[PDB]
């Protein structure tokens, strides 16, 4: 279970600002602009109730506080309930929450009580990070490499295929790889004979998943994964334009997806 740790969420504002500027530099739009382009929707400072959950491994330090800052950053009227779990859910609804935002170890959801729409963090994160990669201004071809085809990677790959991109996929689990290639029609990437990419989407909980033989100078690496798919040196060597942020972007995707 590759879950957030409290230290991933240290000064979430500075992380989200730098990611926002990176998205601006890469796509020409900010995270808000991406969300608008994706869902055709906009914020109206909605009231979102953040409910801490003690289920499974329990409350993660900085989690509900980071969600508060993220929602505030995107101009939402958010609050964290005093009580957790069902008691916290009750408090949220009582205090006039329009969107409930809550997570256990397997599901992080956003539920708009007004319109009945509900978002899952995994597909929402996959779609937005793939969307950002796809909107790279300085891309010469529609070739996109996807590494990691799990709960985040598969929806992201699907989104790229549906946008008529040439999608190359790899996953260390070949069951998931062969199940992805048949269901999506993606070209199975072979690391034995690689090619260079200008657009790369990685959704893996591991480091060093993107080899040097895959990189081209100024390429885009869009990755929600923790830690970093590429080494510090390989990032400098190829001046890789990096889109990586622990919570805010995927949360923005969830919120705008239910508006």
Ligand X SMILES: NC(=O)C1=CN([C@@H]2O[C@H](COP(=O)(O)OP(=O)(O)OC[C@H]3O[C@@H](n4cnc5c(N)ncnc54)[C@H](O)[C@@H]3O)[C@@H](O)[C@H]2O)C=CC1
Residue 134 binds to ligand 0TF (criterion: CB under 6 A) = no
Query: What's the token pair of residue 139?
Result: 């891309």
Query: What's the token pair of residue 72?
Result: 């505030």
Q: Which stretch binds Na ion (CB under 5 A): 11-19, 75-83, 196-204, 249-257?
A: 196-204
Footprint (CB under 5 A) of Mg ion, residues 217-256: 224, 245, 249-250
Containing H/E element for 47? strand 47-51
Facing residues of 118 across strands? 111
Between 88 and 198, CB nearer to ligand 0TF: 88
Residue 144 labelled as part of a binding site: no
Residue 206 labelled as part of a binding site: yes
Between 71 and 125, CB nearer to Na ion: 125
Residue 152 binds to ligand X (criterion: CB under 6 A) = yes
Residues 6+ apart with CB under 8 A from 85: 51, 52, 53, 54, 55
CA distance 12 to 117: 27
Residue 224 binds to Na ion (criterion: CB under 5 A) = no
Q: How many residues bind ligand 0TF (CB under 6 A)?
A: 15
- Spatial strand order of the sheet with 99-103 comes to 77-80, 47-51, 99-103, 108-112, 118-120
Instruction: Give the closest residue to 126 by CA, choosing from 100, 99, 162, 72.
Output: 162
CA distance 133 to 198: 9
Residue 103 labelled as part of a binding site: yes
Q: At 173, phi and psi to the nearest 5? A: -90, 110
Q: For ligand X, what does the binding mask look like between residues 95 and 134, x meaning CB under 6 A?
A: --------------------------xx--x---------
Q: Which stretch binds Na ion (CB under 5 A): 67-75, 136-144, 154-162, 227-235?
A: 227-235
Give the binding site for Na ion (CB under 5 A).
204, 206, 225, 229
Binding-site residue ranges for L-pyrrolysine: 4, 53, 60, 103
Give the binding site for ligand 0TF (CB under 6 A).
3-4, 52-53, 59-60, 63-64, 103-105, 108, 121, 247, 250
């Amino acid at each position: 279970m590759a879950l957030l740790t409290p230290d991933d969420l240290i000064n979430i504002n500075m992380q989200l600002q730098k990611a926002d500027s990176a998205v601006q530099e890469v796509t020409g739009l900010d995270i808000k602009g991406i969300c608008k382009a994706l869902y055709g929707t906009f914020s109206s400072s909605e009231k979102v109730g953040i409910v801490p959950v003690t289920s499974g491994n329990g409350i993660i330090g900085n989690f509900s506080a980071s969600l508060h800052a993220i929602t505030q950053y995107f101009g939402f009227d958010s609050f964290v309930t005093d009580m957790p779990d069902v008691s916290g859910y009750y408090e949220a609804v009582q205090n006039g929450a329009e969107i409930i935002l809550m997570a256990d170890d397997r599901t992080f959801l956003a539920h708009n009580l007004k319109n009945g729409k509900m978002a899952n963090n995994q597909p929402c994160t996959g779609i937005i990070y793939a969307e950002i990669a796809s909107r790279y201004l300085k891309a010469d071809s529609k070739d996109v490499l996807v590494v990691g085809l799990g709960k985040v990677g598969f929806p992201g790959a699907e989104h790229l295929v549906q946008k008529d991109f040439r999608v190359y996929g790899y996953d260390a689990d070949e069951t998931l790889l062969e199940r992805a290639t048949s269901n999506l029609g993606i070209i199975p990437f072979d690391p034995a004979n690689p090619k260079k990419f200008s657009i790369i989407f990685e959704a893996t909980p591991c480091a060093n998943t993107i080899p040097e033989a895959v990189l081209s100078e100024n390429c885009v690496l869009s990755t929600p994964g923790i830690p970093c798919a590429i080494s510090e040196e390989l990032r400098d060597k190829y001046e890789v334009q990096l889109i990586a942020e622990p919570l805010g972007i995927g949360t923005a995707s969830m919120l705008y997806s239910v508006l």
